[PDB]
Amino acid sequence: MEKKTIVLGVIGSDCHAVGNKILDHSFTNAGFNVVNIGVLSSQEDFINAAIETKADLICVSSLYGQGEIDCKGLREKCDEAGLKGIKLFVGGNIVVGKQNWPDVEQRFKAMGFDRVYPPGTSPETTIADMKEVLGVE
């Protein structure tokens, strides 16, 4: 791929745009091609931003404690979508609140989601994450 496109969608319902109004702005500001898929959005649409742009990474934004409940195997759905190579981020209220890292990353990484941000994360982590991951910083 020519550039690194990140595609962030706020997944499932129970989402106004909280921590996804300036939390998107951060990434767009980070010099990334950042496609705002929209607050409340299906994964076949995030996939669609990866078809459109050529995503290197696909982010889900969880604001409802059910991040996993939809998201599980978007890496594999991206894989499945003929968009294999994409490494995924999953951030926010990834589990109900948030459980415990050893178990949680075992969950996410088993599906393929490489990196797990907590609920109420600085975007500096996510930016430093995509940089460090994608041969930057």
Residue list, annotated binding site:
13-17, 61-63, 93-97
Distance CA 77, CA 90 (A): 14
The domain spans of the chain are 1-137
From 16, 25, 56, 114, active-site residue: 16
Q: What radius of gyration, in Å, describes the C-alpha atoms of the chain?
A: 13
Distance CA 135, CA 137 (A): 7
Core vs surface per residue 18-51: b (16+ CB within 10 A) or e: ebbeebbeebeebebbbbbbbbebebebbbbbbb
Which pair of structure tokens corresponds to residue 15? 């989402």
The yes/no answer on whether domain 1-137 falls in CATH 3.40.50.280 is yes
Distance CA 2, CA 4 (A): 7
Running DSSP on this structure, what letter comes out for residue 36? Answer: E
| Cβ within 8 Å of residue 26, ≥6 positions away | 123, 124, 126, 127
Core vs surface per residue 87-112: b (16+ CB within 10 A) or e: bbbbbbbbbeebeeeeebbebbeebb
Q: Is 25 a catalytic residue?
A: no
Helix (H, G, I), strand (E, B) or coil at 3: coil
Distance CA 53, CA 7 (A): 9
Residue list, annotated binding site for adenosylcob(III)alamin:
13-17, 61-63, 93-97
Distance CA 24, CA 88 (A): 16
Tell how strand 5-11 and strand 55-62 pair up: parallel
Q: Report whether 20 contacts 63 (CB < 8 A).
A: yes
Distance CA 127, CA 17 (A): 19
How was this structure determined? It was done by: NMR
Tell how strand 33-41 and strand 5-11 pair up: parallel
Q: Is 45 a catalytic residue?
A: no
